[PDB]
Design a protein around this ligand. Structure first.
Ligand SMILES: C=CCO[C@@H]1O[C@H](CO)[C@@H](O[C@@H]2O[C@H](CO)[C@H](O[C@H]3O[C@H](CO)[C@H](O)[C@H](O)[C@H]3O)[C@H](O)[C@H]2O)[C@H](O)[C@H]1O
Ligand SMILES: C=CCO[C@@H]1O[C@H](CO)[C@@H](O[C@@H]2O[C@H](CO)[C@H](O[C@H]3O[C@H](CO)[C@H](O)[C@H](O)[C@H]3O)[C@H](O)[C@H]2O)[C@H](O)[C@H]1O
Ligand SMILES: C=CCO[C@@H]1O[C@H](CO)[C@@H](O[C@@H]2O[C@H](CO)[C@H](O[C@H]3O[C@H](CO)[C@H](O)[C@H](O)[C@H]3O)[C@H](O)[C@H]2O)[C@H](O)[C@H]1O
Ligand SMILES: OC[C@H]1O[C@H](O[C@@H]2[C@H](O)[C@@H](O)[C@H](O)O[C@@H]2CO)[C@H](O)[C@@H](O)[C@H]1O
Ligand SMILES: OC[C@H]1O[C@H](O[C@@H]2[C@H](O)[C@@H](O)[C@H](O)O[C@@H]2CO)[C@H](O)[C@@H](O)[C@H]1O
Lengths: 149, 150
């Protein structure tokens, strides 16, 4: 299932910075209001809830920068081609968050409910309304879709 | 598939049709029991994103609140029934470890015991606590969580 990763508070979406069909390794993942095929994602299940968040256009997946199992707060989120257990996430569609294997979450850097375009995303352990994400149809940005298959 | 056991987290007991039949009559109660066998296997049939039917594999019947209300009151018995409709929609919350009916209440052991005896009935109730938690595990390994969504 293909989906958009929608920041719940702002309605902006996760994008590779620059919007490329083939972002280089270590391109930062930002929030941006645009919708297009280079911000579509899929989720590749590895072990029950845990899997890879895949950028559809490039096949690269989401990593904490440097590939930590326990990335510190403020570690940047990036795309990278590699596959390993430090790039595992769970797409929590009940609590509306994205949790890294180490137990922290994807946040907008700074924690704004309304981050401007091109705000970087980071790992942070805090839970609040401004780190919530929902997973929606590329044809209807208000319709949640099931990311697990 | 995916086929799974519905395991009451606090006690390790499993959801069964009372009696363990391969073809339970409509309105057979769903109870907790320690036994493992093919007549307590379930599958989840997705209808709308998180919402779907909890299907008894042996019979094809599905989990309902008795009476099929949109908003069943607390203590309404859980049963199996052949019918499909929107009052038999549940979500399998494998993050918070519970099973929520479309009306917003959860599946509980009747009376709230965390160590209920065999044949304890299950019911709808709105409360959230450790004794209403469930996990979804492999029929071949009751300690291994499996993904129920597909
Ligand atoms: C000023 C009016 C005309 O120019 C507009 O200026 C914008 C600057 O405010 C430009 O937007 C920028 O366009 C870049 C690509 O040329 C980048 O946009 C890409 O990357 C984004 C994610 O970082 C999104 O995916 C976006 O869809 C994608 O095109 C840059 O991020 C963006 O600010 C642009 O020249 C034009 O709209
Ligand atoms: C001759 C120089 C040796 O380095 C080579 O080139 C790259 C340096 O640009 C190396 O890649 C870098 O390796 C780092 C680990 O030492 C980082 O890679 C880690 O983090 C990534 C996510 O940011 C991935 O998770 C990756 O799997 C993980 O190892 C850095 O990001 C990466 O560019 C390369 O190892 C080497 O061949
Ligand atoms: C010290 C001896 C006391 O135990 C006696 O033997 C039975 C165990 O086989 C006790 O259990 C009851 O067995 C019933 C069928 O004979 C029912 O079991 C069936 O349904 C269960 C779900 O409700 C399970 O699916 C089980 O696998 C299935 O066989 C009854 O539920 C069970 O309590 C009996 O109470 C006792 O006399
Ligand atoms: O970056 C995500 C976090 O943003 C806010 O924390 C700020 C600031 O970003 C951080 O550098 C600082 O150390 O703490 C600040 C506390 O105001 C949010 O408050 C956090 O919950 C994260 O979302
Ligand atoms: O119990 C689940 C079913 O509830 C309702 O039917 C009840 C009862 O089960 C049935 O035997 C009786 O004859 O009718 C009642 C409804 O008035 C639902 O209408 C069924 O679809 C099942 O949900």
């Amino acid at each position: 299932t293909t989906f958009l990763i929608k920041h719940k508070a702002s309605g902006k979406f996760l994008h590779p910075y620059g919007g490329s069909s083939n972002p280089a390794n270590n391109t930062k993942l930002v929030l941006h209001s645009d919708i297009h095929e280079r911000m579509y994602f899929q989720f590749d299940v590895v072990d029950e809830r845990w899997g890879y968040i895949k950028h559809v256009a490039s096949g690269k997946i989401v990593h904490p920068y440097g590939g930590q199992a326990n990335p510190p707060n403020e570690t940047n989120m990036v795309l990278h081609q590699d596959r390993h257990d430090r790039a595992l996430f769970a797409m929590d569609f009940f609590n509306d968050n994205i949790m890294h294997k180490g137990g922290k979450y994807i946040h907008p850097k700074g924690g704004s409910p309304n981050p401007p375009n091109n705000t970087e995303t980071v790992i942070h352990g805090d839970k609040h309304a401004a780190m919530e994400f929902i997973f929606v149809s590329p044809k209807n940005k208000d319709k949640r879709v099931l990311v697990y298959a």
